[PDB]
A paper describes a structure:
The HIV-1 envelope glycoprotein (Env), a homotrimer of gp120-gp41 heterodimers, mediates virus entry into host cells. The gp120 subunit engages host receptors, while the gp41 subunit contains a fusion peptide (FP) that inserts into the host membrane to effect host and virus membrane fusion. Prior to its binding to host receptors, the HIV-1 Env is characterized by a closed configuration with gp120 protomers packed against each other and the gp41 subunit, while the highly conserved and immunodominant coreceptor-binding region at the Env trimer apex remains occluded by packing of the first and second (V1V2) as well as the third (V3) variable loops. At the trimer base, FP comprises a hydrophobic stretch of 15–20 amino acids at the gp41 N terminus.
We next sought to visualize CD4-induced Env conformational transitions that occur upstream to Population 1 by performing single particle cryo-EM analysis on a sample of BG505 SOSIP that was incubated with sCD4 for 2 h, followed by the addition of VRC34.01 Fab 30 min before sample vitrification. As antibody 17b works synergistically with CD4 to open Env, we rationalized that excluding 17b may allow us to capture earlier stages of CD4-induced Env conformational changes. Two distinct particle populations were revealed in the cryo-EM dataset, which yielded reconstructions of 4.08 Å (Population 4) and 4.14 Å (Population 5) global resolutions. For both populations, all three protomers were bound to one each of CD4 and VRC34.01 Fab. The two populations differed in the extent of rotation of their gp120 subunits. In Population 5, two gp120 protomers were rotated and showed formation of the bridging sheet and α0 helix, while the third protomer remained minimally rotated. The bridging sheet and the α0 helix, which are the structural components associated with CD4-induced Env opening, were only seen in the rotated gp120 protomers. In summary, Population 4 and 5 structures represent conformational states preceding the partially opened Population 1 conformation. Elucidating the stepwise formation of this functional intermediate (Steps 1–4), we describe two structures, Populations 4 and 5, that represent CD4-induced events earlier than Population 1, with the bridging sheet and α0 helix formed in one, two or all three gp120s, in Populations 4, 5 and 1, respectively.
Author numbering:
A (entry chain D): 614 to 664
B (entry chain E): 512 to 550, 567 to 664
C (entry chain F): 512 to 550, 564 to 664
D (entry chain B): 33 to 58, 68 to 118, 208 to 298, 327 to 398, 411 to 457, 461 to 503
E (entry chain K), F (entry chain I): 1 to 52, 52A, 53 to 82, 82A, 82B, 82C, 83 to 100, 100A, ...
G (entry chain J): 1 to 105
H (entry chain N): 1 to 97
Write the structure that this text describes.
Amino acid sequence: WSNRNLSEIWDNMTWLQWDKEISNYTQIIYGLLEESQNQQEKNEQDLLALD
Amino acid sequence: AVGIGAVFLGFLGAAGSTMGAASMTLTVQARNLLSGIVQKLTVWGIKQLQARVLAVERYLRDQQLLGIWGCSGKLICCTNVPWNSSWSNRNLSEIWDNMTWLQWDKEISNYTQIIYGLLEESQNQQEKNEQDLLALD
Amino acid sequence: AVGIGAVFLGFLGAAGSTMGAASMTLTVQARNLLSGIVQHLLKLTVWGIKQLQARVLAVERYLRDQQLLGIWGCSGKLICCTNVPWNSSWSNRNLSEIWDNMTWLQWDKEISNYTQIIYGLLEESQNQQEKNEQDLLALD
Amino acid sequence: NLWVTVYYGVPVWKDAETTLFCASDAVWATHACVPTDPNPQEIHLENVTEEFNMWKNNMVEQMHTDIISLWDQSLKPVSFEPIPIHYCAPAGFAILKCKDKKFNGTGPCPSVSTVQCTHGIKPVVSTQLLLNGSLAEEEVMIRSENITNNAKNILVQFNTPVQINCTRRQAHCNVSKATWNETLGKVVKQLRKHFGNNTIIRFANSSGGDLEVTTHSFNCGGEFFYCNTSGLFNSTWISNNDSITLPCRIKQIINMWQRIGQAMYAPPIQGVIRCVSNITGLILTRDTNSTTETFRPGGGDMRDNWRSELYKYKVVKIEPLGVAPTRCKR
Amino acid sequence: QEVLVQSGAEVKKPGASVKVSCRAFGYTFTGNALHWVRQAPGQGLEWLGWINPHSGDTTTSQKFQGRVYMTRDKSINTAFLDVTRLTSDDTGIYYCARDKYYGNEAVGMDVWGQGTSVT
Amino acid sequence: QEVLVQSGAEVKKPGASVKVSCRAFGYTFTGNALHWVRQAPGQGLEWLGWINPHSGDTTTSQKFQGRVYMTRDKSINTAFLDVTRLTSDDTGIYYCARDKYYGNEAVGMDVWGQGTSVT
Amino acid sequence: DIQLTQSPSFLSASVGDKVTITCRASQGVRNELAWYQQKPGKAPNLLIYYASTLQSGVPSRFSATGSGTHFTLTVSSLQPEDFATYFCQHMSSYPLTFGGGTKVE
Amino acid sequence: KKVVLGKKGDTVELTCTASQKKSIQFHWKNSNQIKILGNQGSFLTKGPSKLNDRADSRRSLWDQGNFPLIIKNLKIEDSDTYICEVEDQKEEVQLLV
Ligand SMILES: *[C@@H]1O[C@H](CO)[C@@H](O[C@@H]2O[C@H](CO)[C@@H](O[C@@H]3O[C@H](CO[C@H]4O[C@H](CO)[C@@H](O)[C@H](O)[C@@H]4O)[C@@H](O)[C@H](O[C@H]4O[C@H](CO)[C@@H](O)[C@H](O)[C@@H]4O)[C@@H]3O)[C@H](O)[C@H]2NC(C)=O)[C@H](O)[C@H]1NC(C)=O
Ligand SMILES: *[C@@H]1O[C@H](CO)[C@@H](O[C@@H]2O[C@H](CO)[C@@H](O[C@@H]3O[C@H](CO)[C@@H](O)[C@H](O)[C@@H]3O)[C@H](O)[C@H]2NC(C)=O)[C@H](O)[C@H]1NC(C)=O
């Protein structure tokens, strides 16, 4: 998903040229952000609420 | 035994499975509650946007009621209101491993407003206005 | 003396009470801002449009108020605290003078002249000075 | 100690009513209607039992008002062919369908599915003989709200479609006789379970009254047929080609579709009108009452036409929010 | 405008039960606690107990514990007083009284009903 | 009601590939995994592999790895089996079977189709 | 792999007999066994899952016991529709394979 | 229990009113529960009783909740007790002649 460094990504381009190349990889990061933390930050504080 | 991973029951599919198993599949039901997208006599342009307005007014009221009993990191949250033991007294292995959600609503439906008043008041006048005393220094 | 517990004053039912007491019953007025409920031979739709317009306007007004609380810091609403210094040019009175001897109506009759500047300070301060701070805190 | 834990998205529903909307394909009165889905999704709900009641169903009243409004728009200036109409639900509501073969009309259903919206139905306007309906499986089904009370009516659903031919010589209908005899043998058998093993069952014609109740009143090809059905319902059954021709008449001003104080003139259009259709069911009325019982043709109230076919479906309203005790401290 | 309207007079045999009602007009009924105070004829005031019209919590004095019950109904803004196992000492006039209820505690009885005579 | 319906019988030369189908009626296809079971004529049953219909993930017996393939189509509720590089040993009856699938593990194959004769 | 032996292979019995047939596994496979019944020209139908629990629709004359390496199924009274072949299945680990089969006549 | 009188060979009117003013289902039977006259909405249907040729009801009052029963050529043998079944209410009426 567009392997670039910080001096490429934060000071010298707009948001249009960012999403123009991230539009290929929309749902593959949106599903991971949908599932991973929302089932992993959950189901562990209930175990932390045991004590 | 051998496994491959989870399966997909679908819309309203957790009414026949156990509550502890139904807790992992709350999100796929919660996505399509509002559904979205959708896309001279007047049909489909009146008497059908009223359905959308009613669905939006139900969803916003439910989301506001969930945000008042303040968690807002939704689909599971805990509260500091103690559970009354007179309201269908059962064990945790009996409810969370052997029972469904619909039979539980069948017993707990007589106590809904008594739940809602205590959840509506007690935490959000006792969790708040003690941080007012905590942030004095 | 002796007590039995709190009571239920009602919707808009504490506007004459004190400042501290009216901040205990904020919750019963947040419900009725959206309210809800509501619930010939098909000649004309003259109040099939206007009631629906009123409901859409109420939904949009509630969404605008929630969006205004969302731009400022919190959305864990009904009370929260921020970091704007309270200048003495806006109604320089003591804490007991405004928190024991005032209704909310007499408060708004004084601070009706300075809503926009307070809203701008809350628009900018916590939303651009608490943010861009945690990224430098999370270096390690 | 246990504390209250609030869950969002709980799959529980309640019995409630709301508006429904049409969905029928992409002529008669349906051009302001939503196109249907290419693949209607259904989800079978195992371990779920609840009760149905097709006599207190609320969908048939809305279908009744909708179909009176659309047909009153249709006739007032057009084709009169019935088009299969699906009935779809808004967001937040669900349609529950009971797919079990054994169903007496009300009571529990041991296996249910949730369907986005129904299989399509043609709004046929007929009395006495059910035309172009959907067929139940297994054996012939008898539905009523009170078998013992004769003040109610009896709904009969077949297993085999009975072929009838509208022809317009006086206009007449053609009925196969042997198929009719074996299907009423099937009907009398199921009436013998519900009334006793030593009962004699008779079938006579209508008792009399308005011509729309006494005769089979239906619409074939835009033409208005009122057929004397004494040749069909004349039989008896003990305590333990051939073809039938039904004479029909065409009237100019009538009473139809349950409207009060009705008169509207209609002439024949052109040509010879001949059509085929399927009897799928019956509506019957029960009448020194220990051995002989006689049932007579009826109809009239057109909500029984929609109740005969919308018995499978009910509308439920999803309540997403729930509370439960849980050992959790925040 | 703030008044309480009471039921009619009742005559009962000993050992029976009596039920009197008290309906509120002119104030929000779920915001002030309600007392039941009795007067034997020719003597002073005797206290029974007091009820919150919102939560349904009750409090009866220990002399009349298990004998005098207080219920409520928010639909018609009314409280019911039940007195069971009657003897001759319970004959007198009964009042429902509204407490001012400032700061979540009992303050003073400002609104009184017309009285119910039971014999 | 919960019934599996497959394609008809196929006769095909050695060295080629064959494709059979299995479509589910009466239940939700994506809620239970599916096994495939073969039987030589006059012999016992033999197992090939099993497919999760929701994810499309496959698990194959290691005698038949790289030789039998499993696909799915959610729009028409079908699971497809492919056998490539045919010999004379594979002639027999192919069944698709629904696992009962309690607790995210294999339990028992309770619903079977009526079989496919592959020669 | 995993080997399963059914004993006996061919059993002869009359109508109404109580018959117990035995399945052996080469290792401990704990309790995940399933019993199936097949008639010729038909698909097998499931009788027992979890090696002791009855399938819905299977009548009460069928039963099954066992653990580890040893399992039995028992019919209390043979009916003429029960004369078929009976299979025992493990799913502890890959591969899943089938037993030798026991036809009762 | 209302009582109405009639003359020999004349027309008697049997009144039976509803709670509301709406065209809605009703039934008219006799003491032996034999159906005389009812509706299927506004389609008047007659029973297998002996009085079927002389039974009549006013359709134009059916919108007003009045559900009458008109009898012409009144004989001796029809002095019975008539049941007007209108939503689980048995408005019993006696006929004398
Ligand atoms: C409508 O308007 C009327 C009058 O305008 C209000 O009635 C007043 O309500 C207030 C409550 O906010 C009452 O104030 C209370 O007075 C109590 C008694 O005070 C006397 O005794 C103390 C010593 O104990 C003396 O110092 C004092 O001078 C008095 O002689 C106090 O004990 C109460 O204190 C409690 O609250 C304060 C809040 O700051 C705490 O600091 C205390 O620790 C304690 O918890 C309280 O101050 C007042 O007496 C009422 N009557 C008047 C002014 O005549 C109604 O309340 C209002 N309606 C509504 C719905 O609000
Ligand atoms: C519908 O209802 C049936 C009840 O007949 C449910 O079947 C039950 O499912 C549970 C778990 O899915 C089984 O529990 C299991 O027990 C074994 C015994 O060793 C053990 O490995 C675990 O404790 C496991 O939970 C249970 O045996 C089974 N049967 C009964 C009679 O309870 C079924 O899950 C329900 N839901 C669906 C979607 O079918």
